[PDB]
Every structure is written in C-alpha cells, then in structure tokens.
C-alpha cells in the first residue's frame with residue numbers, strides 16, 4: 194500500500210466532482226442522442242483495440258466527449274470528429290507513444306481531413322481549458338484493487354468489464370460519479386467470481402456502504418444481464434479474450450440478494 | 452489570443468529546447484515579469500505536442516510555492532505560449548557558480564526542505580515529475596527553490612509504464628529504472644533528490660555514469676551491489692546479471708564527509724535500493740535533519 198494512497202484518493206474524489214458533466218445535456222442537444230453516443234463510444238472501443246491503446250485512454254476520451262457535449266451543440270455529422278479529437282487528446286495524455294494524426298484520420302474513412310482533426314483538437318482543448326487529467330472509473334478501480342487481500346485477476350478483469358460497459362450508456366450512468374460506478378463494478382465482480390461482498394476496508398476508505406451503492410449496483414446488474422442483447426457489442430467481444438479471462442462469457446448471478 | 456501576445460514585451464531569450472524557445476518578457480499593462488515558453492505548432496504538424504498536453508494539464512493542477520507557476524496559456528493558430536512566473540537562476544548554474552566556496556549547509560538544508568515540499572505536493576496529487584535534475588530546479592534572490600520542467604511528468608492514478616526514450620538523464624536515474632523495472636513509482640523522484648542533495652554537499656555529482664552499465668556500477672560501488680536480502684526480487688529484474696561484480700557498501704561518512712549523523716541518515720533513506728523502502732517526501736520532511744531549517748538567501752552572481 195503506497196504512502197500517498199489516501200491523499201490521492203481523497204484528491205481524486207475531489208476532482209471527479211469538478212470534471213462532472215451535466216447529467217441532462219443530451220435532451221438539450223438538438224441533433225444527437227444517447228443512441229448516437231453509444232454508437233460512438235462502441236466505435237472508440239474498437240479503435241482502442243485496433244491500436245492497442247490502454248483502457249484509461251478510452252475512459253479519458255469518453256470523459257472529454259461528455260464534458261464537451263455538455264456545453265457545445267454538435268450535429269450528427271460532426272459527433273465523430275469530436276470523438277476522434279477526444280481520443281487523440283486522450284492518447285497524447287495517457288499513451289507512452291500516441292498514434293500519429295494520420296491514423297486518426299484514417300480510422301474515420303476520410304470522413305474528416307487532417308486539418309479538421311487538428312482544428313477540433315484545438316477547439317476541444319479550449320472548451321475543456323486544457324484540463325485533461327480527469328478521474329476515471331479505471332483509476333478508482335485501481336485504487337480499490339489494492340484492498341483485495343486475495344488478489345484475484347478474474348475479479349479485476351470482470352470489474353474492468355463492468356466499468357467499461359457503463360461508458361456506453363449515458364442513461365443512466367451519466368448520473369453516477371466514477372468512484373460509485375467503480376464501487377458497484379467492484380462488488381458485482383467480486384460477488385460473481387468469489388461470492389464475497391464489498392469489503393469492510395473499502396467501506397472505511399470510500400465511506401460508501403453497500404446500501405449507498407445499491408441504486409448504481411441495480412442498474413449495473415441489469416446492464417450485465419442485458420449485455421448480450423445490447424445493440425453495441427465491442428466491449429463484450431474485447432472481453433472474450435484470454436487476456437481478460439473471458440469474463441464477458443461469465444454468467445451474471447440471477448439476483449444480488451442485497 | 453493575439454491581443455494577449457501584444458501585451459507582452461520580449462526582454463531577451465533565456466533558453467532553448469526541443470519544445471521551443473523561452474523568453475523573459477514583461478506584461479506591458481501590469482509590469483509583471485514573466486517567462487514565455489514558445490511552441491511552434493508547424494514544426495511537426497502533429498497537433499499540440501504530447502509533452503505540452505501533460506505539462507499544461509498537470510501544472511495547472513499544481514499550485515504550490517515550491518512548484519513553478521503556470522500563469523497562462525495562449526493558443527493561437529500556429530503557436531502555443533505557456534506563461535510562467537520568472538525566477539533568476541537554476542540550481543545547476545548556481546552549484547557551478549558556488550564551486551569555489553560551496554553552497555553553505557543551512558542553504559542546502561533549506562533547498563532540500565523546499566524541494567521535498569514541492570515534491571510531496573506533486574505525489575499527493577498523483578503526479579510524478581520524473582526529470583529531477585539541478586537544471587530543472589529554479590531559484591530566486593529571496594531563497595526559494597521550485598520544481599520546474601514538467602515535460603516528462605505523468606499522472607499516476609493508473610500505473611505509469613517505463614519507456615526507454617522518455618527518461619531523466621543518467622546521473623539522476625534510479626536503480627530500478629536501470630535494472631529494467633516495468634513501472635515507475637514516486638521513489639524515482641526521491642532518488643534524484645538524494646543525488647542532488649549529495650552533489651550540493653560535496654560539490655561533485657554522486658554517480659556520474661558514462662553509460663547505463665557504468666551508472667549502475669558507480670551506484671553499486673558506493674552503495675554495495677544489492678542482493679535479495681537488501682532488495683527482494685532484484686536478481687529477477689530484466690537487466691540484472693548474475694555476473695555483476697559484488698561490491699561492498701562504502702562507509703557513508705566517506706561518501707558525504709561534511710554531513711552530520713542526521714544528514715547521513717536522511718540521505719541513506721533517500722538512496723534505499725528497494726523502491727518500496729525508499730523514504731517518501733512526506734516522511735523525509737519529518738526527519739530530524741530539518742529540525743532547525745531556516746530560509747537563507749543565496750549569493751546569486753548575476
């Protein structure tokens with residue numbers, strides 16, 4: 194357990210409340226929908242797989258996109274451009290060696306020019322005021338994982354899987370803090386794989402009780418159950434890989450007995 | 452954007468670099484003196500440089516008296532300007548200018564104290580500097596020292612991976628990195644600080660390696676070649692070789708002769724081989740060496 198563990202946690206909890214997008218920004222958008230967003234993120238998941246990018250990158254790009262759309266009206270035809278710029282910025286921030294812009298222009302099927310991608314990068318940076326170091330579910334899960342005495346790789350992979358699915362559906366996940374979605378994904382994965390529940394050490398650390406996570410836990414469970422029937426499948430496919438112990442194939446418990 | 456740039460009067464070039472050029476400048480309306488880091492965005496046509504992305508985003512989160520302050524960011528069409536507070540000198544030029552007399556001990560104590568405060572702030576905010584060397588530490592006439600050049604800094608809410616091309620210069624590189632560890636940790640910055648602390652005290656670099664292997668050997672020769680007892684897992688590291696010479700640990704009072712018991716104690720803890728065991732900046736600040744720290748003013752020959 195690191196020496197600044199608690200400080201960093203306390204701080205990430207502070208920042209996540211600031212980098213929080215407007216929950217109901219989609220109704221205020223005149224041309225795009227949750228569905229279009231889902232199609233966008235799902236696409237970014239594939240792009241992330243195509244260039245072997247870190248999961249954090251995917252998460253950062255989504256955070257950028259929701260913050261951007263929280264204040265900027267965007268038309269169908271430009272939604273992917275924003276997403277591309279977001280992914281590019283996220284790659285530049287998180288990746289050791291980010292893909293070249295030409296690659297990001299390539300993965301759009303020449304829908305946008307190199308010029309348009311770079312201008313959108315500029316606009317996104319302006320709109321986000323260069324605040325790119327946002328807290329993610331990914332980060333919180335990482336923090337939580339160190340309270341797993343019985344370090345279990347299956348639990349982690351499943352937790353990561355559940356967390357990644359939450360990115361696809363603005364409804365109802367936009368209304369949950371990254372630290373809460375992580376708490377729910379952690380418990381669900383722990384429960385499913387070991388039958389264990391949200392640990393006492395994490396209750397003391399986060400201040401979240403199993404009762405507080407219930408609302409988000411219930412939704413995450415339903416998303417897990419419906420995962421196979423979802424219009425978007427990139428995340429499930431990705432988690433069929435042995436790298437993640439094929440947890441997308443694991444069957445969700447029928448109930449949570451909460 | 453273009454208006455903000457007009458409010459600045461360029462004084463003189465104060466530095467070069469990969470990212471671009473740095474100028475000392477003055478705000479025409481307020482009279483505030485500043486340092487302008489200029490970045491030409493047409494030299495690579497790859498958008499805003501990753502290095503700038505991170506330096507800006509992480510720096511604007513780090514407001515602390517011992518961390519260089521980023522005052523503004525002006526993003527024109529073909530240029531990016533970062534505006535910083537201005538400081539008169541960097542630690543490397545100061546050490547060089549102090550060769551004859553040597554930086555006085557109380558001042559060395561003060562600088563270390565302040566550096567640990569800035570570094571602790573970084574770490575407790577999940578930021579790793581990763582490039583701590585005399586040249587990236589700024590000092591003013593009042594006695595303050597601040598961390599600067601976050602061109603290689605990284606947020607570690609999620610583990611930061613080691614990368615051959617992006618690493619601090621050899622002399623201040625921690626042993627784990629040299630032995631090929633997979634992930635960075637806050638310990639690499641403390642190691643660098645330890646090497647700097649010793650350099651100030653003795654007037655000579657502590658481990659001046661000519662290459663990666665020579666760097667390791669110089670460390671081994673002074674601190675002793677580490678074994679499994681000293682550093683569990685060391686013999687399993689990617690670049691460890693069973694053929695490494697087995698040197699014994701030199702007596703510390705001969706390594707940093709002018710230092711007292713407290714100083715030697717603090718330095719040895721900053722140079723612990725096992726990164727998990729290396730003292731944190733937070734804990735270093737509680738060390739008795741800083742019992743009587745004061746804030747002397749340097750002799751800045753300018």
Ligand SMILES: C[C@H](C(=O)/N=C1\C=C(C2CC2)N=N1)c1ccc(N2CCNC2=O)cc1
Pocket residue numbers: 463464465466473475486488519535536537538539540541589599600
């Ligand atoms: C070390 C110091 C320095 O770099 N100071 C800084 C740098 C910053 C920000 C970039 C982060 N803030 N203060 C310096 C170096 C050269 C000059 N020079 C050289 C010729 N004339 C002159 O005045 C003046 C100051």
